[PDB]
Design a binder for this molecule. Structure first.
Ligand code: CDL
Ligand code: PC1
Ligand code: PC1
Ligand code: 3PE
Ligand code: 3PE
Ligand code: 3PE
Ligand code: MYR
Lengths: 111, 165, 87, 65, 13, 171, 459, 177, 79, 122, 62, 155
């Protein structure tokens, strides 16, 4: 449980970290595209662990970690569903996006 | 579909960048040998799109056609799905014919170059995906339905025959 | 990608396409050869010459500009102006 | 040395891109032939489809009257 | 070689 | 932690690992790496912070409202009594809202927990959900944005007249 | 409430005794201190309102309106100090005095326990607003604008006065706390029909109701920037606040008196949003978008469910911040090109990229991008109106198409495309301008983290 | 129809524009270069048949039914050059074409980063402001009464003068900035 | 810097489909003047490109060789 | 797909309707017909969390295959035999469904011949 | 400082998120609800030791 | 700007039409106002109702993205006929024939989906057989009640 949910949230927080880096900047970056591509390759690697332990046991969970707002009988929480659909789509999207960004370091180089 | 379709757009963008932002297939051609890695990956992606057996599109789309044939189905929807399956082969070889085969139709100052490690490695990982990812995913996912595996021979061979036609 | 054009390179390519044209003898051709007065060409021939220039350099010359390019040097100057050569 | 552009003629090719392209084409055909050798039923059919006309009335329970 | 000045608006402010 | 009666869970039955292959799975090695590299430093930091809490222990309290007279035993237009009745009614309405939220949390936790056999194994939570939503609906629905204890009492008296008329006509 | 009223009044000797170079700095500083002080009003309870005295109270409806009101004054001073730089010093102090006086009238409009004192502060807000528009507005039409703003209000509000005094003669009190417990049902009659109209039409004008809205695309357009900021952000919400207070007394007749007005709002938000697709004046487009957004608040207050009141107060706070920011962005382009024509200065992202990012964020909040409080209010009103009648989703959903379409068109026309060649006075964005945009946009986005403080008394 | 210098298109200009449009659409229909080359020679033979036509009413009639011929036989998606209007890369770089006057609004700390560039910019600005009054008085001594007839501008006539209204032609952005 | 263009005299349309085009134009009294401009597309390294089934069967030879080697390898490894 | 042409272009009175069939009793033509034996316990496929589509008369091979697929991780190619056993028993179930279809079609042919013989005789 | 990326972008977030999940999220009810593990005939329960009995013997088909 | 260069009322006398044609920088023979039916157009010219996409793109426009010169009278719906919006350009297929082909294709496809819904395809099989009274407890049937026995037999 503690491996699954932690690496699940680490994948998403890791994706948010270069946004925080580019918004808190002063200099001209030493290849910010390489940093975003490295981050997404690492998020692919980190997302493969809950995917493997879903392939092992069928391990699914829901992380309702932050209560956001209760409209009288509708409790809205920041809630993440780690089921088959997320467990397969997140690594495929991260793998494809990692290829798209290493492609973009070439294709968008003049930009 | 993610693997081979992202790779087909990346191969198209490799062609577009090598031909100085040319995107029309009537000003292409002769790129079989001039862009060999883009050619290899474009042919592998077009075969994965059309459902070549045991590439990645086979492990989903062929099962989709077999399940759509052998089910209580709107028959016109099935027939239009099969006509669309033949049309996929038609536009895939339209891409391969006008972009890669034949003789050049692009301008005379050839700047054809795909020798960047970024381009090669990024197309390479989706190429390994377009070869093996359908096999790996379809043998790792749990059964969630009961797969229909008993059907007559003309109905098992529908998708492959329609694609070949 | 996209190698920069020079005036000598544009001049060489314009004269190259005109030397590959069977209605122009390549020994009489120069950069100042007027197509109608020196080379004896038709206006349809001039339209075809500008279309071959367009196919050569990969961009369109509009018809209000194409009808005024009556020697190779005017074509070279037009392509120079539209591509900003010798920065 | 990077690729120098050419005029009206076939471009310069690196040896590396040619051997990579040939390797992945050969890998595709190896994978197709290997999986067709080992599976052969995802393409051609897994189980024999029975003929309903060949079924006798005894096993289907049809009393002749 | 042949580096060109890129005209851009003032990014100081 | 919490109270395991208001938020119940069935006992966890995990199966013992019965490996059939000779290949070592990466999940056990990554679990050991998560226990060493992650779980022990987090545990040591939390033990430090917990010692710092235990150095200065202090308490907070759950506020107990005693029961004041409700709106039925307040004289009409007597604002001093019906103010307190209205405040009591608003607190009870907010608590009934949270009771419905507790039962919905039980229903959703059962649906995730029982998984693919959720429809058979969550009939009790579904039945408790149906009962508490029927009670909440009879008590508070259709009162409007300007609800009060008077609106709720008028709704209850209308419902009781309908029930009395249905009992009278069926006998 | 007197811990806010007295510092707001002390801003008057603060502006009139300041040194001539210090009158913007001092009033900005101490109005920001009053705005920091305004968070003590968040002592709200789940059952009782925060009842200070016989004269003043503050529940969770009035509290975000008060915090937004006290927050808008420093932002109005920042927005107005540049175009009043060449002004006479005493007229500059009179301008700041009108803004201070308007804040003073607003903060005891929203906290007025008794309804006729609400009426007097509510109508007292007219006089500084009229003076600001007609004296410091830029064009001729401000004079005509000052008439429309004056006379759609009073023609609606003088029947309210009579109506309130009638309640004073019937209930014996106009204390809202007493009227919470002494409210009697209002049956179907003609007398109660015109009672309903007299109670509602002043606030219908203030919102504005569609068909009564014509004062707004003159009053918000011809005003100076601080005038437009307070008109769109606060003074429209006097109508919604007053409806949410006054519909306590109007039950059950509202259940069929709301039917025409709901139609006027549900079709009106289709009309005015469509009007925004063909506006050539950018500031007029922002004004008509305010009419379209307040149409939802009218529908939500008239259907009077908990979800609709929560959505309506969230949408009032969110629209206050968003419309005030949009008027400030349009003013930042007006202070460079000196025309409010939207097609004039194009391609401004090539010239002003950070201000283009502010345009982007304000457009995204205008089209109610989740999870902004714009979308929270929008969505909760849509939920409640779907429960009212399932067909309303058509007129709701189509509105959200058109709202997207005019929001990005505004963003595409001014920021994108090719820049206008002959315009060469596009100065880089001043620190004051980006500061004004951030002081709108950063609290607006931070309220998505904790939106329960802007969900009103029946959260 | 709409031209900066001429008020109209002559018949010869209409024939040549039809010939170029017909060859481009024929190349779109006839993708391969030898097949286009054959049919382009056939189309040139169709244009050379009525080339020596002296009757201008007959020539205008032939041009009109040739336009009907073209409108029936045009390609639905003809080839457009990428930077040409309607192309896939047309006006792509206009977001990067910052005008030169924005350099006047740079801070002195970022003007000091390019000392020789701005020192060379100031003599362009000096040249422009000493050329302006001479080129205005050139335009008003050369434009006829009632205003200019065409949009054509004159060249510089003296040695030392610049052509009138030259600054935004010369200092225009690059196509690839 | 300086780019050396190839010679223009080498681009002759004999042996190309432009020769067939010129023959079919001269059969009806016409002549193609732009053939040598197009002649480079059909000459050199751009002449004799593969067909479509030759494009699909790229790498089939080495793939089939590796297939035969792997089948023989598992057929010897099972015993 | 010849049965589609026999139902749609031919007569539908002799062709079985799929949405409502069998229309004949199951003992009609069978002396001592036996029931289908369910191997997997209801609690066993409840605890195995099978999909309700998958809890048919051959779910026991599916339970064996899923236990193999769990126990042989990461070797995901190591349970071809259990998968083929489940696929073959699903094949046998589908053949039984085909036999039910052919049984209903031949009994409708019997009813057609019965009513035609009754019309021609009496 | 050669693998500072795996320290600052992976391991410090795994530390922070594991602290947050272990001591603030799972200390609250129904925040991480996991699907109960799939039980097969023949399994042994770790919490109890009760061996799940195997299935009935198959009427073998092939 | 001043008052005699602003738009005004509908021109009635020919000298008023001439001076308002001079105001909008256009010929008197080209100036046509909107017809005076009281809609509020005044003397503003009715320009030929074409999109700005139809303008010559190779001309040196003062506003190149708008394809519009300085001082040229703008169309009443210029913000509508920008190139981001309504295009009126000539189409290779006629408008009515395009509408006929699109409507005929969509109507034929909807008709044939209705036909194939009325006559569906299926396989020559019986219904799928589930044990335990068609999985009565699994589908949510209550255990205190007892359903009718759904019995399946061998074949
Ligand atoms: C209480 C503590 C809170 C801490 C956390 C903060 C919470 C949010 C607060 C508000 C944050 C906004 C600040 C940045 C935007 C405005 C300024 C700007 O543009 O600067 C560009 C600049 C970097 O750009 P540049 O290259 O230098 O120049 C810009 C270019 O000119 C060209 O610019 P550009 O166009 O390339 O780039 C602009 C780009 C443009 O990108 C977009 O417009 C796309 C955004 C929409 C799509 C993606 C997001 C969709 C929604 C998902 C996210 C929310 C939910 C996530 C949770 C999981 C799911 C539920 O915007 C961004 O990248 C901004 C990222 C964040 C976007 C937030 C959503 C805005 C969309 C509209 C409303 C949506 C709903 C509200 C959401 C509220 C969430 C809290 O940024 C800065 O310098 C940042 C300065 C410091 C910012 C401080 C922020 C907090 C202030 C609060 C103070 C008080 C509390 C203390 C907290 C302090 C924390 C450090
Ligand atoms: C790099 C900075 C990170 C922190 C560095 C310093 C700390 C180092 C590591 C230790 C961690 C800190 C201690 C643990 C954290 C606090 C735990 C805790 O109990 O916190 C109290 C609570 C936890 O929730 P809660 O349920 O206890 O309380 C919520 C409050 N009520 C009940 C009133 C609703 O708050 C947080 O943790 C806040 C952080 C939330 C993180 C996600 C933010 C997403 C923002 C999206 C905005 C819009 C949402 C809209 C959609 C919502 C869904 C529909
Ligand atoms: C912004 C423009 C539109 C503004 C609209 C404003 C509201 C429209 C309706 C106003 C009606 C007049 C005030 C009603 C106050 C109700 C008080 C009350 O107790 O009513 C019940 C009382 C009942 O009398 P009573 O209460 O003394 O009787 C005892 C009770 N019964 C009936 C049981 C015996 O109503 C009246 O006395 C008359 C009400 C109608 C008045 C008709 C005359 C005015 C018509 C409308 C004018 C509106 C503005 C015109 C100007 C427009 C702009 C230039
Ligand atoms: C996959 C199985 C491929 C093998 C079976 C089909 C072979 C076939 O029918 O090929 C026909 C055809 C080649 O023959 P054709 O083009 O008619 O004649 C030119 C002489 N080479 O066309 C082809 O071979 C091209 C079609 C290949 C499709 C492969 C992907 C499916
Ligand atoms: C233009 C700008 C945009 C608009 C701004 C706002 C203007 C409109 C404001 C008023 C809206 C309409 C009036 C309110 C309608 C509420 C319901 C109603 O009165 O229904 C019509 C009424 C039905 O009759 P009934 O319900 O029996 O009434 C008897 C009550 N004892 O029908 C009748 O009795 C017939 C009609 C009688 C005359 C009524 C005149 C007074 C009301 C309108 C003023
Ligand atoms: C499961 C059910 C499935 C049902 C499927 C069928 C239902 C929908 C039927 C069609 C309705 C939508 C299509 C019509 C609107 C499309 C507008 C659009 O895309 O305009 C594009 C146009 C220019 O685009 P284009 O010419 O292609 O660009 C080439 C480069 N110049 O750009 C412009 O002209 C810009 C115009 C901006 C303003 C647009 C105003 C129109 C808004 C229409 C809203 C319709 C709302 C419908 C609500 C329904 C509620 C249920
Ligand atoms: C009877 O025909 C059963 C098969 C399903 C209905 C007809 C489907 C026809 C299309 C599939 C076969 C195509 C062969 C090329």
């Amino acid at each position: 449980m503690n491996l699954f949910s932690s690496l699940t949230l680490v994948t998403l927080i890791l994706l948010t970290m270069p946004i925080a880096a580019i918004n808190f900047n002063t200099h001209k970056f030493t290849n910010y595209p390489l940093y975003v591509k490295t981050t997404i390759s690492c998020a692919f690697i980190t997302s493969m662990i809950p995917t493997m332990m879903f392939i092992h046991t069928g391990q699914e969970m829901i992380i309702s970690n932050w209560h956001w707002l209760t409209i009288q009988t509708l409790k809205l929480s920041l809630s993440f569903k780690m089921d088959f659909f997320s467990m397969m789509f997140v690594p495929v999207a991260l793998f494809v996006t990692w290829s798209i960004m290493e492609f973009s370091m070439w294709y968008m180089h003049s930009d | 579909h993610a693997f081979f379709k992202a790779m087909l757009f990346m191969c198209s963008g490799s062609i577009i960048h090598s031909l100085n932002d040319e995107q029309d297939i009537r000003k292409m051609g002769g790129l079989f040998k001039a862009m060999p890695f883009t050619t290899t990956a474009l042919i592998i992606g077009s075969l994965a799109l059309t459902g070549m057996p045991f590439l990645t599109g086979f492990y989903s789309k062929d099962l989709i056609i077999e399940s759509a044939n052998t089910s209580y189905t709107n028959a016109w929807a099935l027939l239009m799905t099969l006509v669309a399956t033949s049309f996929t082969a038609i536009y895939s070889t339209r891409i391969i014919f006008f972009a890669l085969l034949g003789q050049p139709r692009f301008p005379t100052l050839i700047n054809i170059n795909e020798n960047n490690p970024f381009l090669i490695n990024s197309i390479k990982r989706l190429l390994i995906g377009s070869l093996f990812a359908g096999f790996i995913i379809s043998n790792n996912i749990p059964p969630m339905t009961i797969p229909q595996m008993t059907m007559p021979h003309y109905l098992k061979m529908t998708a492959l025959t329609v694609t070949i036609l | 990608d996209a190698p920069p054009l020079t005036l000598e390179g544009i001049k060489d390519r314009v004269l190259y396409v005109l030397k590959l044209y069977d209605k122009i003898d390549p020994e009489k051709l120069s950069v100042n050869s007027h197509f109608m007065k020196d080379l004896g060409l038709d206006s349809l021939d001039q339209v075809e010459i500008i279309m071959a220039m367009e196919d050569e350099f990969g961009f369109e010359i509009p018809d209000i500009d194409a009808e005024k390019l009556m020697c190779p040097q005017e074509i070279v100057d037009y392509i120079a102006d539209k591509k900003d050569v010798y920065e | 040395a990077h690729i120098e552009p050419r005029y009206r003629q076939f471009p310069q090719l690196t040896r590396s891109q040619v051997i990579q392209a040939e390797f992945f084409s050969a890998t595709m055909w190896f994978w197709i032939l290997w999986r067709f050798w080992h599976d052969s039923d995802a393409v051609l059919g897994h189980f024999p489809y029975p003929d309903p006309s060949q079924w006798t009335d005894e096993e289907l329970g049809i009393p002749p009257d | 070689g042949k580096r060109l000045f890129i005209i851009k608006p003032s990014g100081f402010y | 932690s919490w109270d395991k009666d208001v938020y119940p869970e069935p006992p966890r039955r995990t199966p013992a690992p019965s490996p059939q292959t000779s290949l070592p799975n990466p999940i056990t090695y990554l679990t050991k790496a998560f226990d060493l590299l992650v779980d022990r430093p987090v545990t040591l930091v939390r033990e430090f912070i917990e010692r710092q809490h235990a150095k200065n222990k202090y308490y907070y309290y759950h506020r107990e409202f005693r029961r004041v007279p409700d709106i039925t035993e307040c004289h009409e237009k007597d604002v001093l009594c019906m103010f307190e009745a209205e405040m009591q009614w608003k607190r009870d309405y907010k608590v009934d809202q949270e009771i419905v939220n507790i039962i919905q949390e039980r229903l959703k936790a059962c649906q995730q927990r029982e998984g693919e056999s959720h429809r058979q194994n969550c009939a009790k939570e579904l039945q408790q959900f149906t009962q508490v939503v029927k009670a909440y609906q009879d008590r508070y629905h259709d009162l409007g944005a300007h609800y009060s204890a008077r609106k709720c009492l008028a709704k209850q008296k209308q419902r009781m007249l309908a029930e009395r008329k249905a009992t009278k006509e069926a006998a | 409430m007197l811990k806010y009223i007295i510092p707001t009044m002390m801003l008057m000797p603060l502006t009139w005794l300041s040194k001539n170079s210090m009158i913007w700095i001092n009033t900005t500083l101490h109005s920001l201190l009053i705005s920091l002080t305004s968070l003590l009003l968040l002592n709200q309870f789940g059952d009782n309102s925060l009842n200070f005295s016989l004269t003043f109270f503050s529940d969770s409806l009035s509290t975000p309106l008060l915090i937004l009101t006290m927050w808008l004054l420093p932002l109005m001073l920042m927005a107005s100090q540049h175009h009043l730089s060449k002004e006479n010093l005493a007229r500059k102090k009179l301008f700041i005095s009108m803004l201070i006086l308007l804040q003073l009238f607003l903060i005891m409009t929203f906290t007025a326990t008794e309804l006729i004192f609400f009426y007097i502060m509510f109508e007292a807000t007219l006089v500084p607003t009229l003076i600001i528009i007609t004296r410091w507005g830029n064009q001729t039409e401000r004079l005509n604008a000052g008439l429309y703003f004056l006379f759609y209000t009073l023609a609606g509000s003088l029947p309210l006065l009579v109506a309130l005094i009638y309640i004073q003669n019937t209930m014996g009190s106009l204390n809202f706390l007493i009227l919470q417990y002494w409210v009697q049902p209002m049956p179907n009659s003609w007398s109660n029909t015109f009672m309903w109209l007299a109670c509602m039409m002043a606030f219908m004008v203030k919102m504005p109701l569609y068909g009564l809205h014509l004062w707004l695309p003159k009053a918000h357009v011809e005003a100076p920037i601080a005038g437009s900021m307070v008109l769109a952000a606060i003074l429209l919400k006097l109508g919604g606040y007053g409806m949410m207070r006054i519909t306590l007394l109007l039950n059950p007749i509202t259940d069929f008196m709301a039917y025409p007005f709901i139609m006027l709002s549900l079709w009106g938000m289709i009309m005015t949003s469509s009007i925004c697709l063909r506006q050539t004046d950018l500031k007029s487009l922002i004004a008509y978008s305010s009419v379209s957004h307040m149409a939802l608040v009218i529908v939500a207050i008239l259907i009077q469910t908990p979800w609709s009141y929560m959505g309506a107060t969230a949408l009032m706070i969110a629209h206050g911040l968003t419309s005030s920011m949009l008027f400030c962005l349009a003013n930042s382009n007006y202070e460079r090109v000196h025309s409010r024509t939207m097609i004039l200065a194009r391609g401004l992202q090539t010239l002003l990229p950070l201000m283009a990012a502010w345009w982007l964020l304000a457009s995204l909040t205008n089209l109610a991008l989740p999870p902004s409080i714009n979308l929270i209010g929008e969505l909760f009103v849509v939920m409640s109106t779907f429960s009212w009648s399932n067909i309303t989703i058509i007129l709701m959903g189509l509105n959200m198409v058109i709202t997207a379409l005019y929001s990005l068109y505004m963003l595409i026309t001014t920021q994108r495309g090719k820049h206008t060649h002959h315009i060469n006075n596009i100065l880089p964005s001043f620190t004051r301008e980006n500061a004004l945009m951030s002081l709108h946009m950063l609290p607006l986005l931070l309220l998505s983290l904790n939106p329960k403080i802007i969900l009103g008394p029946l959260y | 129809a709409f031209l900066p210098s001429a008020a109209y298109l002559t018949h010869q200009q209409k024939v040549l524009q039809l010939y170029k449009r017909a060859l481009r659409h024929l190349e779109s229909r006839c993708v391969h270069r030898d097949k286009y080359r054959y049919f382009a020679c056939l189309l040139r033979a169709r244009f050379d048949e009525h080339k020596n036509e002296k009757d201008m009413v007959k020539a205008t009639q032939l041009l009109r039914e040739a336009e009907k011929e073209f409108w029936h036989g045009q390609h639905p998606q003809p080839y457009i050059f990428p930077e040409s209007p309607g192309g896939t890369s047309y006006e792509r770089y206009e977001c990067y074409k910052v005008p030169e006057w924005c350099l006047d609004d740079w801070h002195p700390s970022e003007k000091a980063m390019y000392p020789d560039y701005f020192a060379k910019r100031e003599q362009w600005k000096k040249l422009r402001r000493e050329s302006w009054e001479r080129e205005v008085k050139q335009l008003q001594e050369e434009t006829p009464v009632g205003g200019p007839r065409t949009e054509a501008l004159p060249p510089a006539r003296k040695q030392g003068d610049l052509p009138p209204l030259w600054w935004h032609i010369v200092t225009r952005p690059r196509e690839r900035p | 810097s300086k780019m050396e263009l190839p010679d223009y005299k080498q681009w002759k349309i004999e042996g190309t489909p432009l020769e067939t085009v010129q023959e079919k134009l001269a059969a009806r009294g016409l002549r193609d003047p732009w053939g040598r401009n197009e002649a480079w597309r059909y000459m050199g390294g751009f002449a004799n490109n593969v067909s479509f089934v030759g494009a699909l069967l790229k790498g089939f030879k080495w793939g089939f060789a590796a297939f035969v080697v792997a089948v023989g390898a598992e057929y010897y490894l099972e015993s | 797909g010849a049965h589609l042409a026999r139902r749609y272009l031919g007569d539908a009175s002799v062709e079985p309707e799929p949405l409502r069939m069998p229309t004949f009793p199951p003992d009609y033509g069978f002396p001592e017909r036996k029931e289908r034996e369910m191997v997997a316990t209801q609690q066993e496929m409840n605890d195995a969390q099978l999909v309700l589509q998958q809890r048919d008369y051959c779910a026991h091979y599916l339970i064996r295959f899923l236990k193999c697929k769990r126990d042989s991780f990461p070797n995901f190619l190591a349970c071809k035999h259990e998968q083929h056993d489940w696929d073959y028993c699903e094949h046998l179930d589908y053949v039984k469904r085909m036999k039910e279809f052919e049984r209903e079609r031949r009994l409708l042919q019997r009813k057609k011949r019965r009513e035609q013989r009754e019309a021609d005789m009496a | 400082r050669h693998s500072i990326f795996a320290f600052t972008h992976v391991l410090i977030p795994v530390w922070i998120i594991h602290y947050y999940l272990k001591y603030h999220v799972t200390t609250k009810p129904y925040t991480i609800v996991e699907k109960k593990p799939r039980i097969f005939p023949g399994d042994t329960i770790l919490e109890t030791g009760e061996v799940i009995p195997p299935m009935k013997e198959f009427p073998d088909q092939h | 700007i001043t008052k005699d260069m602003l738009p005004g009322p509908y021109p009635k006398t020919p000298e008023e039409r001439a001076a308002a044609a001079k105001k909008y920088n256009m010929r008197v023979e080209d100036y046509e106002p909107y017809p005076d039916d009281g809609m509020g157009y005044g003397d503003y010219p009715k320009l030929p109702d074409r999109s700005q996409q139809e303008r010559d793109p190779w001309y040196d426009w003062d506003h190149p993205d708008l394809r519009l010169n300085w001082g040229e009278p703008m169309h009443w719906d210029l913000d509508m006929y920008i190139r981001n919006r309504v295009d009126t350009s000539p189409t290779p297929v006629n408008w009515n024939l395009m509408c006929k082909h699109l409507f005929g294709f969509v109507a034929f496809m909807l008709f044939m989906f209705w036909v194939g819904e009325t006559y569906p395809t299926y396989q020559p099989v019986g219904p799928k057989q589930y044990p335990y009274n068609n999985l009565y407890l699994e589908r949510g049937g209550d255990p205190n009640k007892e359903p009718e026995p759904v019995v399946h037999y061998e074949i």
